[PDB]
Symmetry: C2
Subunit: 299 residues, 2 copies
């Protein structure tokens, strides 16, 4: 069962390069605004304890070089929204898709278009970890690359890459500049918290396995939400809520396996392992498919 | 992370092809639409299709080609091996720079999975040693294509034709020649035992050393023959002297001789991971080529 990224064409046509002094990163060009991480205005000296309000008052439009391929876009205004810099430009992007800015929850999934200095390089599907980091690609200049979902012809942008954390994972904001997780855009000591497995996604993936004919892990038992959660916490799994059970309802109806029955199967898999078997061709449980993703893909 | 290529250049080439009651995907490049020739088959025809006989009975107007909301007029048709080539009225204004290439098992590429002309998702994969592809959920994804992009040029290497009984996919290059022993006929054909792409695992281990992970190395070496005798017991592909030569650059970069990395792999197969990960993976990854790894 292969994870897929969304087709990236609609976002490719929005990627540009933003340069401020010695610093270059990626920007997102939608109509006549370019969005990018505000730390593009920072020197290395400023990045130790930057005062962004003061640093931007000292900048003018001529400080910003924006290039869309082989075309310079002239900046005619600049402002900040939280941690995102907004550059008003000469020209509306003729390739702007229908789009929205949305904020996602930990455990939800999206595609990332990894870009280097305005040039799209690759696309991958990922989940926002419960500790609010993204286990991401190995790039050097991918700052400002964005994450998104597509529904019909509408691109929902949910993520912009700002920082690489010492453990090798990525941290960022939504497109309104609000950070995901307890991180700041500063060269200081910060580390990802202890991550956990996304339980509701593992359950969704077990439902996908049942829809695809792999049923060896099903058993006769049921558990309770309370006692499953005690097994979850003991195995570094997120707790399961009544809302999670409700989200899994369509898959329980389709397969005939109640959610607390599937929790019983997962509880046994966590205590006794796979005993040499695989679930979807995998000896490890996967937690980067949401219930929405599985409904979308399977039913 | 295994990344796919940005799919935009291929998205602009996907169309829907309908013949009778059968519909699948086509690839529109310049004034030609490429699609599986079994678009001219019903389900029953697939048991024993005679493609020459089925095709001689068609006119251009039997082929309905839709590019979004625009019908494309077919003005000629021709069969090349297992691919149908529909000449249309209009050259695709979105045609990228492109080439057709035939790949070898072990090579990687991205697939743009499409349903009835509409792009649905993109994934990165490898052509397995048994000439199949582990595919995606979409039922009617026939005609979806696989590709690499190098310097803004799309090299198309794969077109999906057939779903095999175990759930994997089989197909052709863009000249219509199947990969492997498969045919565009519903027979009892099945994927053979798959094996692991050894040269790709070794390239990935080098990537891990280059990125700072060294825990799996040991003090041993191996002969090539002893490595292959062991690796085959784990259903790994044999490693050839070509493969050893290909890894030379990474060997030079890391100061780890190729057969020393082979000795490490032997131990990894014997021991498993013991709870650890190598890059971000709890599994030995075999879908990064040595070309992929250098950058």
């Amino acid at each position: 069962f292969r994870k897929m990224a969304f087709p990236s064409g609609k976002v490719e046509g929005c990627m540009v390069q933003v340069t401020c002094g010695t610093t270059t990163l990626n920007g997102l060009w939608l109509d006549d605004v370019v969005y990018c991480p505000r730390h593009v205005i920072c020197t290395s000296e400023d990045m130790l304890n930057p005062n962004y309000e003061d640093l931007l008052i000292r900048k003018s439009n001529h400080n910003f070089l924006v290039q869309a391929g082989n075309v310079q876009l002239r900046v005619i205004g600049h402002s900040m929204q939280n941690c995102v810099l907004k550059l008003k430009v000469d020209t509306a992007n003729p390739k702007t898709p229908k789009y929205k800015f949305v904020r996602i929850q930990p455990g939800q999934t999206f595609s990332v278009l990894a870009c280097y200095n305005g040039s799209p390089s690759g696309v991958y599907q990922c989940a926002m970890r419960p500790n609010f980091t993204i286990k991401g690609s190995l790039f050097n200049g991918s700052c400002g690359s964005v994450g998104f979902n597509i529904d019909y012809d509408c691109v929902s942008f949910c993520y912009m890459h700002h920082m690489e954390l010492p453990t090798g994972v990525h941290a960022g904001t939504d497109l309104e500049g609000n950070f995901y997780g307890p991180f700041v855009d500063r060269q200081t000591a910060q580390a990802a918290g202890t991550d956990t497995t996304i339980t509701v996604n593992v359950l969704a993936w077990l439902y996908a396995a049942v829809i695809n004919g792999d049923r060896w892990f099903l058993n006769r038992f049921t558990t309770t939400l309370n006692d499953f959660n005690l097994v979850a916490m003991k195995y570094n799994y997120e707790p399961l809520t009544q809302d999670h059970v409700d989200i899994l309802g369509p898959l329980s109806a389709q397969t005939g396996i109640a959610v607390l029955d599937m929790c019983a199967s997962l509880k046994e898999l966590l205590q006794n392992g796979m005993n040499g078997r695989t679930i979807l061709g995998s000896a490890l449980l996967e937690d980067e498919f949401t219930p929405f993703d599985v409904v979308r893909q399977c039913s």
